[PDB]
């Protein structure tokens with residue numbers, strides 16, 4: 001799954017079985033690294 | 049939050065030209081002029 005954005009380590013408390021994340025808008029805004037078990041935040045690059 | 053989420057899909061909100069301080073100044077001016085000059 002592809003996209004674009006700025007990656008930041010996330011302090012949200014994912015449960016062991018959960019793998020993805022979603023927002024109120026119901027779009028991907030949090031993913032878990034496959035090779036190593038870390039949770040990162042996704043935020044699109046600035047626009048205006 | 050939800051307000052910020054909408055901001056990320058091509059939806060934007062502009063700020064009003066007149067701020068609350070200016071609105072309050074206008075209202076106070078009207079009130080004072082009234083009570084002092086009919």
Ligand SMILES: *[C@@H]1O[C@H](CO)[C@@H](O)[C@H](O)[C@H]1NC(C)=O
Pocket residue numbers: 035036
């Ligand atoms: C594959 O990558 C993971 C994460 O670094 C590591 O734990 C594992 O040892 C690796 N396996 C091999 C064969 O390199």
